[PDB]
Amino acid sequence: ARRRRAEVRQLQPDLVYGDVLVTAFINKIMRDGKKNLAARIFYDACKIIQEKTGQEPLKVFKQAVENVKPRMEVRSRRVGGANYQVPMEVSPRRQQSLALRWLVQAANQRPERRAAVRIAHELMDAAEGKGGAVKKKEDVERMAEANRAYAHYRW
Amino acid sequence: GNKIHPIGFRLGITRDWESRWYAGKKQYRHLLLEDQRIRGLLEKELYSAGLARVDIERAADNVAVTVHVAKPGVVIGRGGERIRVLREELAKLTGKNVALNVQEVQNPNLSAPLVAQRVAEQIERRFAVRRAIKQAVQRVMESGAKGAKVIVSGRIGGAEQARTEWAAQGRVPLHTLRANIDYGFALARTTYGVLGVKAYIFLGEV
Amino acid sequence: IRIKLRGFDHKTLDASAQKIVEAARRSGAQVSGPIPLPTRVRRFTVIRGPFKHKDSREHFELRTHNRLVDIINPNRKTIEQLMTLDLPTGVEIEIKT
Amino acid sequence: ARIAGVEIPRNKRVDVALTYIYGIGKARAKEALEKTGINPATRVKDLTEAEVVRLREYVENTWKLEGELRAEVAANIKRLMDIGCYRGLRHRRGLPVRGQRTRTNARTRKGPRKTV
Amino acid sequence: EQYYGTGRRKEAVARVFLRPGNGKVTVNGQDFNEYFQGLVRAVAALEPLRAVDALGHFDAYITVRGGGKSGQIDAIKLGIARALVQYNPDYRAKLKPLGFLTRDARVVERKKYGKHKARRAPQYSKR
Amino acid sequence: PRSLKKGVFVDDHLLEKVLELNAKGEKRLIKTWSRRSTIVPEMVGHTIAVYNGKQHVPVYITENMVGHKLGEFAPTRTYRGHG
Amino acid sequence: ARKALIEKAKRTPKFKVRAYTRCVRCGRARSVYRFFGLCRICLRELAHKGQLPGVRKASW
Amino acid sequence: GKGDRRTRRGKIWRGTYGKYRPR
RNA sequence: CCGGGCACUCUAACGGGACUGCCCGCGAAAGCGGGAGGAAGGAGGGGACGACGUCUGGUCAGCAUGGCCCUUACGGCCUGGGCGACACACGUGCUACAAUGCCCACUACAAAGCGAUGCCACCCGGCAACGGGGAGCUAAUCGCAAAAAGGUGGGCCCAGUUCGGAUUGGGGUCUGCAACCCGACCCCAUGAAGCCGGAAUCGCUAGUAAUCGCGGAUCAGCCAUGCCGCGGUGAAUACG
Ligand SMILES: [Mg+2]
Ligand SMILES: [Mg+2]
Ligand SMILES: [Mg+2]
Ligand SMILES: [Mg+2]
Ligand SMILES: [Mg+2]
Ligand SMILES: [Mg+2]
Ligand SMILES: [Mg+2]
Ligand SMILES: [Mg+2]
Ligand SMILES: [Mg+2]
Ligand SMILES: [Mg+2]
Ligand SMILES: [Mg+2]
Ligand SMILES: [Mg+2]
Ligand SMILES: [Mg+2]
Ligand SMILES: [Mg+2]
Ligand SMILES: [Mg+2]
Ligand SMILES: [Mg+2]
Ligand SMILES: [Mg+2]
Ligand SMILES: [Mg+2]
Ligand SMILES: [Mg+2]
Ligand SMILES: [Mg+2]
Ligand SMILES: [Mg+2]
Ligand SMILES: [Mg+2]
Ligand SMILES: [Mg+2]
Ligand SMILES: [Mg+2]
Ligand SMILES: [Mg+2]
Ligand SMILES: [Mg+2]
Ligand SMILES: [Mg+2]
Ligand SMILES: [Mg+2]
Ligand SMILES: [Mg+2]
Ligand SMILES: [Mg+2]
Ligand SMILES: [Mg+2]
Ligand SMILES: [Mg+2]
Ligand SMILES: [Mg+2]
Ligand SMILES: [Mg+2]
Ligand SMILES: [Mg+2]
Ligand SMILES: [Mg+2]
Ligand SMILES: [Zn+2]
Known about the structure:
The structure is cut from a larger assembly and holds 8 protein chains of 8 kinds. Chain C is an alpha+beta fold and 97 residues long.
């Protein structure tokens, strides 16, 4: 807000992987403050991304995450009388947030019926470079590229 | 109009109740009702005397009414006369052991509702309201008081345009709870309508 | 010997719960100490002003505290001196066996 | 149009399939499965013709269904409307019968809004 | 013989007893994993002992009252951490950087008049 | 509605007036203020003027209208439509 | 329609359902607390005065 | 289905009992 | 459960404890940044608390009150009706549109309160609303009372559906003199709109939002999905 830069909340590490990054992904799945249900679905996905592909879920998950991180985004700023889509770098804190949110949102677009499955399948295709989350990243990345001419309007 | 009643803000802190007793669920209403009729009876009669507080205590089917007043004689009567004369009328309505005492008022100018009633009475007598308040605050502070504030509201002097006039001196910390402040209010009926008088006296901070 | 103390005021309840336990522990013999029973609270919610103004309320409450004391080794050495005990007005007392 | 005048949905469990008949809810469905001794969890595409003809015969004889049930509901309202009772007025102006407010809402009895 | 600490969380309170053995754990007359089955957060109640590598050195007979399952879990996490500094006062280190020594005072905030909850204000529309 | 454990409700003062007419030779108009009263098998054939707050409605009683109240057949609200 | 009502409230009804609490102080038909016999308006008036045993402003 | 009286959840919401939520 | 014990937990009163007190650093001071100790650190979180005044704000309908008005009535009493109307229009809400779901069964963990023509354990008749009995308790004893989400399991398989519960038919329960207008509740049948909402627009910064149940006042009963409270689970984000 106005006064001072607020403090970032560090999440209590997950009990299956001891990972602060995994905890975040969990919370974005959490509807209605029902974390336990969100815990299953994600861990269930760890089960699924093991069966349909014999390797470490944490390795699947984390690599999938990196492939969704946008390095450049466009933030609107109506200078003069027109709305300019100013290109901006994305801080790692936001790169994390946007990748995770999109990753879960991309999951909820898929046609597979169980939540456990979708999370797996998106995380599966994400590390392999596909999936709606990576589609959104590439989009937002080209938009900032397209508007490279407004580099001098950056804050 | 935003300020809180300064009495209820201090109950159990700097000010003590005026009906001190326990009662279960099924009797509270009936006992309180009598406490209203009794106050109703006395405050009606004892204005002449200069009523300051009507304390009430209870045990079983009996009640001690400790009545503070500046003129004990108007309460006492001729030799002990009136003090009992009411006690029969009192116990007529009460129908029980009415222990009707009379307590001294050390300084009547350090009694808020007394100061109020006085001023309210004065303005029923066409008295200079601007003056009247300035005097009461002046008399209260001479009585060694630590603070004083007096407010009069309504058709002051008979003017069709209503006006709220006030005066204060020393300290009157209404935001403090440890600050002991007496408050009293009196209604001044006239030919042109109701006038309201409030009194704020700051005795001392405990 | 079951003395139960009910009152709107605990400063008088605990003060009287002193005077009671003091007397029978003096005049023999055993009194099981003053236990502070949980207080029963009757809260009232009221609209501040007389007309409309719904979203402005004031909070009131009525706190009937409770105390309990026992006399373990009774004996009528106490049964008359307790019968002569200066009880405040804001308190109700019960006796049992 | 197997039973009872309606052809109940195949590939669905026999208990729910009966609810697609006018006159039968889940309740009368739980009933006819004991009273005929048929497994509620099996599909209708898996019903024995024996199990069929029994469930059919029972249900058509124990309860009033389709057109007849619709007939009495109609007959019940027709009279209420004709005697001139309040219940009849509300059926004749198409307004809510069960004492609801009519200042707002009531959209199911009236139909879509006719603005002004 | 016995090592004790009081653990509390919101409305939950935990009395916990650490007594050496094979590593058994019991909560309210029930086995730990039995009273906390299907809750992932339960593995965090056994957290402080892992900060001092005493996983199976102590057993635990624990009761718990008030609050909820995960509230009760944090109370447990506090009392078994409490009990360690009584068994080993030199265990203050490597248990406080993990902050296990402290009790988080965050409780359900009061519902206010004029709001639907503690802060959720009723929706409004001027013109 | 009214519990079957209790009785079929007529105001009695009206039920009285009905029976007296059946004996002495029916029938004339009945001014009543009992909308809460149940129509009853003895009331059949008469014509009872039921007050709705403003006027008494001339109501012929038949067989098909037995279980209802007298008030259902005397409308309380005036309404001819909108606009 | 006030004084004939504050007196109609006192007398016993023809049926028990017709019993309704009025404020024993001012006669207010609405918001009447059984425990005091008072309406929320009078309740707040006396409680501030201190003329209500034990009754004090709540805070938590 | 906090509004459907013919369910467990529905009678909970109403605060009532019956065949579908017995005691 | 009994002996026993007050340890613990609690209960409810009285105290302690936080003061930038202490180290490093920047400072003219006040302070600010960081460290330690410590349950808590820089107002620890919430409440109570609202300056002179503003709005000729609201309230003659809670009450008071000047004055103006009515007098077989503009007073008063009663029966019925209305305040619940309905071509429509707005605000605040409830329940939804479903698979992070819905249903059935079994199994857990709260807090605050209330309760003598009052709460009603248990028992038996009814699918049930309930009804008959009947134990206890002026209640840290007895009861409302099950917390619900959660948990183990089984069903449903993407369909206007086992989603959704409106509307209507019918049979009943309860209160109350009396449920036509015009009560709630129960059971069978009926199973509407609704596939996430145009322009527009509201709230919330941490135990918060979201979501789940629970109690109280008023009150015969109840149109409470309202209000005032209480715990359970429990986020995202603040560049500026
Ligand atoms: Mg996206
Ligand atoms: Mg509101
Ligand atoms: Mg059907
Ligand atoms: Mg209705
Ligand atoms: Mg209507
Ligand atoms: Mg487990
Ligand atoms: Mg809450
Ligand atoms: Mg508004
Ligand atoms: Mg009149
Ligand atoms: Mg009057
Ligand atoms: Mg009534
Ligand atoms: Mg009332
Ligand atoms: Mg349903
Ligand atoms: Mg002790
Ligand atoms: Mg600071
Ligand atoms: Mg302050
Ligand atoms: Mg004006
Ligand atoms: Mg008036
Ligand atoms: Mg006037
Ligand atoms: Mg009416
Ligand atoms: Mg109205
Ligand atoms: Mg609503
Ligand atoms: Mg909603
Ligand atoms: Mg359909
Ligand atoms: Mg449709
Ligand atoms: Mg359906
Ligand atoms: Mg019907
Ligand atoms: Mg009705
Ligand atoms: Mg669909
Ligand atoms: Mg939704
Ligand atoms: Mg919408
Ligand atoms: Mg804020
Ligand atoms: Mg829900
Ligand atoms: Mg509720
Ligand atoms: Mg209640
Ligand atoms: Mg009620
Ligand atoms: Zn009143």
